[PDB]
Design a protein around this nucleic acid. Structure first.
Ligand SMILES: [K+]
Ligand SMILES: [K+]
Ligand SMILES: [K+]
Ligand SMILES: [K+]
Ligand SMILES: [K+]
Ligand SMILES: [Mg+2]
Ligand SMILES: [Mg+2]
Ligand SMILES: [Mg+2]
Ligand SMILES: [Mg+2]
Ligand SMILES: [Mg+2]
Ligand SMILES: [Mg+2]
Ligand SMILES: [Mg+2]
Ligand SMILES: [Mg+2]
Ligand SMILES: [Mg+2]
Ligand SMILES: [Mg+2]
Ligand SMILES: [Mg+2]
Ligand SMILES: [Mg+2]
Ligand code: NA
Ligand code: NA
Ligand code: NA
Ligand code: NA
Ligand code: NA
Ligand code: NA
Ligand code: NA
Ligand code: NA
Ligand code: NA
Lengths: 59, 140, 57, 178, 72
RNA sequence: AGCCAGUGAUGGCCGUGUAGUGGACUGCCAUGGCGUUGACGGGAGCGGGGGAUUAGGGUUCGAUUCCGGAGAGGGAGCCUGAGAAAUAGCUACCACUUCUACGGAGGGCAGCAGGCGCGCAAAUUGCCCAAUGUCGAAAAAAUACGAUGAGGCAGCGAAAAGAAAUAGAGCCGACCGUGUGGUUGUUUUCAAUGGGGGAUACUCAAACCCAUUCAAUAUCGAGUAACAAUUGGAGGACAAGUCUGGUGCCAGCACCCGCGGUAAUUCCAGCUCCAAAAGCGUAUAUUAAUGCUGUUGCUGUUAAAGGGUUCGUAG
RNA sequence: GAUCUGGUUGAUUCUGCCAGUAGUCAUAUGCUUGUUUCAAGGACUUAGCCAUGC
């Protein structure tokens, strides 16, 4: 039947977004990324860079 | 091998004309039978009136209820079945309202595990169903 | 000129004021302040033109 | 509605949207020349492709062909004068070996940094957009300006700029009025 | 020029014109033809299968627009 | 798969009508003309110059600004003109329609702007003859201003196209990795510039937008730059998490393969990250991918496909 | 730029189609939008019906 519709979206607890400083935009953003991965890290001759690595938590 | 003539262009033209009817893609664009059977008269979207809300089951490996509605079109009074996407989103439809209906992709072929459904609901009361979902707008 | 201290235009010189009045276009004289006064709005003129098409004399 | 103006397109998106090798090569170019968006790179791609395509057609033509001589001279004149090819290379076959950074070397944002008027490659773009650079005593404020070979020594600060011999700028003026 | 095809009329004959048409896609030819009716004076006497030269005229009938000179 | 001839079909002879030739038409005569090299009939469709996609060959679109043709609700006749079988000319009939004193009289936006309806779907009931031209009994000036919704100008407008902001240099701690050189926040100066607003004013036919300029004795202004960038995604194709909560084959995602039955790499959310960016998703049609229409250039023993065998005309 | 990838099996090599991918002065709808230049704009369906002014 149609008795249960939108059940999950109405059940999930509410959580609010965080407040953060605005990131640079435009040409300043591309500049930030270029130093984010090609500088500011000394991992050279290995190319073993991971853009998004998470802490170990696998329960 | 085949005909290699230098004066045999007539035979080669006739061959290609006859054999071009054998592919379903080319035949569908030159035959006019598809447009008549298509509830949209060759149009991207269409407007209709909601008749009732139905729940159709999913195909065998899956198991669910897909929450469709029955819609009668306005331009030609044909009846179709359309699927309302996203969580919840059935409470925004109601009965006797007026909706904008679009294709599902694949150009008339059924999509996914929903049996025989090839249309989706886009606008309800001319506001936008996804905008209602994201709360960017309120129902008139 | 863009981003500069230069400007270019056109210029006319007439032998006397009498020749200037005769030849200069009206809107150019009106810029100085000495052209013909004004004329009524064009809409009213063409309105009466059709009205007086129903009448004689 | 009864108009006869013209317009066209200057760039083109690439097929295969996500190749890790092309993604990194393009990112390297952007963060080192200080570009704003990938469309600036893709402009250079098409202008390069046009010279290569016409050179390929001409090279296929036999030598002493009237079309080959006239067009061949014209393209070398443009390539030498613009600074793409050094004056020793003249065979029309060095056109095809042109690469992307060769064209990006002649950009006004680059040349300002090379001459030493700026402390970085992003400082130079800010200066260009804010009406400080004059090429031949004419203020130019468009980074994509491609400097000719006969105009590098004439590049200098503009008179109207505060860094030149102009009036004090915004900070000085509002401090005085304070 | 053409080939006399039929001489069943009175002071009138039919001539056939054979040519070859070139289709661009297949880089090959194909035979075509056109039929044309003309007026033939009693000075001449052509049989079916001869060659004739014809020059333009003014409209002499519903279809006739050419006249026969120098049967060969 | 046959078409054309009473009542013109193909040709001939004197004629008539036209501006003129002609079967355009009257009388008489002959029996012709077209067709598998696709006639006759049916379907879609205004032609072209050209657009999109492009190794090459091709496929597809073209109502639309230039050229040609046709029409003015439906369909026929005709006067005046050198020229019309004209729609802001006339006459009648057919369908809808306005005023009236009930005797009658009118109306034709597929011209300009505007309304109803139809639909997925499309702008102001604006100003001007300054430019470009046409018409004219006209050059401009005066005791004396030709018309012109052709035409041009501005309002609305992410169809699409071209440029391009949302910050640049350093300071002092805290550091991060690597071997002392970029780097990641914390305090803090120091210049520069345009969104924004105003003219001695330029433009303008008059207004607007650009372009100049914040003294030339003499002219306002970023610092949690609150002047705050979004739209889609993170199992594979395909760039990007073996992160943390909720649900429990339900709710839902999923273009395809698939995910969900208590530890969900896929659902609903928070945090990070990725693409491209004043742009970005979805639907439908179409081009390339497609050597899956093959002339260049396919396949036919078994995957779809060699006729049961001979003779034979056009080709 | 003369380019391809996922789905038939316990594995393998094929034929073959579904799905992915890039455009479109190509239309429409959704979300979001500071500056400037150039611009198409009731063909698509109903050559449907039209108040008022020119
Ligand atoms: K008429
Ligand atoms: K109109
Ligand atoms: K902003
Ligand atoms: K998630
Ligand atoms: K094949
Ligand atoms: Mg038509
Ligand atoms: Mg049409
Ligand atoms: Mg025309
Ligand atoms: Mg009219
Ligand atoms: Mg629109
Ligand atoms: Mg898709
Ligand atoms: Mg799993
Ligand atoms: Mg194709
Ligand atoms: Mg056999
Ligand atoms: Mg048999
Ligand atoms: Mg099998
Ligand atoms: Mg219409
Ligand atoms: Na040149
Ligand atoms: Na139009
Ligand atoms: Na007409
Ligand atoms: Na009408
Ligand atoms: Na009428
Ligand atoms: Na005029
Ligand atoms: Na105009
Ligand atoms: Na190919
Ligand atoms: Na078989």
């Amino acid at each position: 039947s149609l008795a249960r519709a939108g059940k999950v979206k109405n059940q999930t607890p509410k959580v609010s977004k965080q407040e953060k400083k605005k990131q640079p935009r435009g040409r300043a953003f591309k500049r930030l990324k270029y130093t984010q991965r090609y500088l500011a890290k000394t991992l050279k001759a290995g190319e073993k860079l991971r853009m998004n690595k998470q802490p170990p938590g696998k329960a | 091998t085949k005909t290699n003539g230098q004066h045999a262009a007539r035979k080669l033209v006739r061959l290609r004309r006859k054999n071009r009817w054998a592919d379903k893609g080319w035949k569908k664009s030159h035959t006019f039978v598809a447009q008549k059977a298509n509830p949209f008269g060759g149009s991207s979207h269409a407007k209709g009136i909601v008749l009732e809300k139905i729940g159709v089951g999913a195909k065998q490996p899956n198991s669910a209820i897909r929450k469709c509605v029955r819609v009668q079109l306005i331009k030609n009074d044909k009846k179709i079945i359309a699927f309302v996407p996203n969580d919840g989103c059935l409470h925004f439809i109601e009965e006797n309202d007026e909706v904008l209906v679009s294709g599902f992709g694949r150009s008339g072929h059924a999509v996914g595990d929903i049996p025989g459904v090839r249309f989706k609901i886009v606008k309800v009361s001319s506001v936008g169903l996804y905008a209602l979902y994201r709360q960017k707008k309120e129902k008139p | 000129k863009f981003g500069g201290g230069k400007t270019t235009g056109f210029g006319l010189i007439y032998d006397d004021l009498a020749a200037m009045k005769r030849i200069e276009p009206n809107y150019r004289k009106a810029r100085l302040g000495m052209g013909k006064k004004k004329l009524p709005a064009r809409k009213s003129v063409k309105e009466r033109r059709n009205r007086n098409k129903k009448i004689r004399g | 509605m009864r108009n006869y103006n013209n317009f066209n397109r200057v760039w083109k998106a690439p097929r295969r949207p996500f190749e890790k090798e092309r993604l990194d090569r393009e990112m390297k170019l952007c963060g080192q020349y200080g570009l704003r968006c990938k469309r600036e790179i893709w402009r250079v791609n098409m202008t390069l492709s046009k010279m290569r395509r016409t050179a390929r057609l001409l090279l296929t033509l036999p030598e002493n062909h009237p079309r080959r001589l006239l067009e061949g001279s014209a393209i070398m004149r443009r390539c030498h004068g613009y600074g793409f090819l050094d004056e020793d290379k003249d065979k029309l076959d060095y056109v095809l070996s042109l690469t992307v950074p060769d064209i990006l070397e002649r950009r006004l944002q680059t040349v300002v940094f090379k001459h030493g008027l700026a402390k970085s490659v992003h400082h130079s773009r800010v200066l260009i957009q804010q009406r400080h650079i004059a090429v031949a005593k004419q203020i130019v404020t468009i980074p994509s300006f491609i400097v000719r070979v006969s105009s590098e020594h004439h590049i200098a600060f503009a008179d109207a700029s505060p860094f030149g011999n102009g009036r004090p700028g915004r900070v000085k003026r509002v401090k005085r009025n304070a | 020029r053409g080939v006399v095809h039929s001489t069943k009329m009175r002071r009138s004959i039919v001539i056939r014109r054979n040519y070859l048409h070139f289709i661009r896609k297949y880089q090959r030819y194909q035979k075509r033809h056109r039929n044309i009716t003309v007026h033939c004076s009693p000075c001449f006497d052509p049989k079916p299968g001869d060659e004739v030269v014809v020059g333009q005229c003014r409209p002499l009938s519903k279809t006739i627009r050419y006249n026969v000179l120098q049967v060969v």
